[PDB]
Structure 1
Amino acid sequence: SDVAPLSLGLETAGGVMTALIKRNSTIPTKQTQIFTTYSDNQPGVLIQVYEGERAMTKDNNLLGRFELSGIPPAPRGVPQIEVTFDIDANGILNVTATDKSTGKANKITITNDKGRLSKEEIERMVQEAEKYKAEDEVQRERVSMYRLPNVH
């Protein structure tokens, strides 16, 4: 089958690239993942869709953005935001985010138009990750470390 030429994911807290569909994954495909809030009573979540292999979204390519508001106040980590990345056989990417507390959903359709990447630009972004692989490895391992509470 065809494949995703670049990894696709979302920005998670701290400017982290969190991939839902990995580079060279077979397409069509869909991946569904549950996300939650960063702070108590957080009223909305920022959904920014990125493509690329680097560990931090500042270094990847923004494909689309939307906000989901109206989240009921709750302790951090309790709201459940269901995100689905859905790629068709032509590579067209639909992203849906749904607040399971109320059922309010938001969605974007990301097409394959003129501002998108060519084979050579795709190839260059692959090179970029390899050059920064060791540094990006440390960023990802940092994201994965458990956090300890403060003293006093």
Structure 2
Amino acid sequence: HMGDKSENVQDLLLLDVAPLSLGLETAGGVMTALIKRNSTIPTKQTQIFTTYSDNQPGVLIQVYEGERAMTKDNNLLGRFELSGIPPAPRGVPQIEVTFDIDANGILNVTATDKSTGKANKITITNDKGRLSKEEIERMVQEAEKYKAEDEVQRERVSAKNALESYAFNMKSAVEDEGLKGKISE
């Protein structure tokens, strides 16, 4: 009368290398790759980032999926704020951000406040990505053209690795291609 619930198999195959670059967007909407593309995963990389504040020192980690110097035109992957810092952040102590990928398919990011010795994490699961497979191709192919823009806008915005306190990602809804074109002879 009382049986057991048959569990289904829920594993899946992932990629061996990172098809895209994972990292943080710097104040300005420019993608700052922490884990670059073509890297063997799972992998754990750590890079040093800084923070820019308006009036109150607040650190927010904007995690983005893909290599895109136009991150402000795209949708953010994840974001976690760092708070609970006893000492006064003067902008001098840098923020250490570590991206540790697990074989199960989860991205465990961990930011360490070198100002107080605190560490915060969040398990982000994208599996195969949030963007469409067709868009993944653009994220790879166009990554080289935005690479040229990157070095330019990087200095123009004056943000190499500066994380902003609050990133306002506008929910720009992608429009369905209704532009009926035609080739000419």
Cα distance change, pair 86–15 in 1 and its aligned pair in 2 (3 A): same
Unaligned stretches of 5+ residues in structure 1: none
Contact 1:37 1:79 in 2 (8 A): no
Unaligned stretches of 5+ residues in structure 2: 1-15, 157-176
**2:129 aligns to what SS in structure 1?**
coil
Report deviation, 1:130. 4.2
**2:104 aligns to what SS in structure 1?**
coil
Is the radius of gyration larger for structure 1 or structure 2? 2
CA distance in 2 between counterparts of 1:50 and 1:96 reads 14
Following TM superposition, where does structure 1 have runs of at least 4 consecutive aligned residues deviating by more than 6 angstroms?
144-152
Which one scores higher on RCO, CA 8 angstroms, separation ≥ 6? 2
Deviation readout 1:32-56 (Å, 9 max, x if unpaired): 1222332597521111100122214
Identity of paired residues, percent? 94
Report deviation, 1:100. 2.2
CA RMSD of aligned residues (A): 11.2
**2:139 aligns to what SS in structure 1?**
helix
CA distance in 2 between counterparts of 1:148 and 1:73 reads 60
Report deviation, 1:122. 1.3
1:31 is matched with which residue: 25, 39, 45? 45
Cα distance change, pair 60–128 in 1 and its aligned pair in 2 (3 A): farther
CA distance in 1 between counterparts of 2:126 and 2:146 reads 28
Report deviation, 1:136. 3.6
Deviation readout 1:53-100 (Å, 9 max, x if unpaired): 221421344111111123456575312322101112344211111212
1:113 is matched with which residue: 107, 119, 127? 127
TM-score, scaled relative to structure 1: 0.74
Contact 1:96 1:108 in 2 (8 A): yes
**Counterpart mapping for 1:1-150 below 5 A:** 2-39=16-53, 42-71=56-85, 74=88, 76-112=90-126, 116-130=130-144, 132-140=146-154, 142=156
Cα distance change, pair 150–136 in 1 and its aligned pair in 2 (3 A): farther
Cα distance change, pair 41–135 in 1 and its aligned pair in 2 (3 A): closer
CA distance in 1 between counterparts of 2:85 and 2:145 reads 40
Contact 1:95 1:107 in 2 (8 A): yes
CA distance in 1 between counterparts of 2:143 and 2:109 reads 24
Q: Which has the higher strand share?
A: 1
Q: Which has the higher helix share?
A: 1
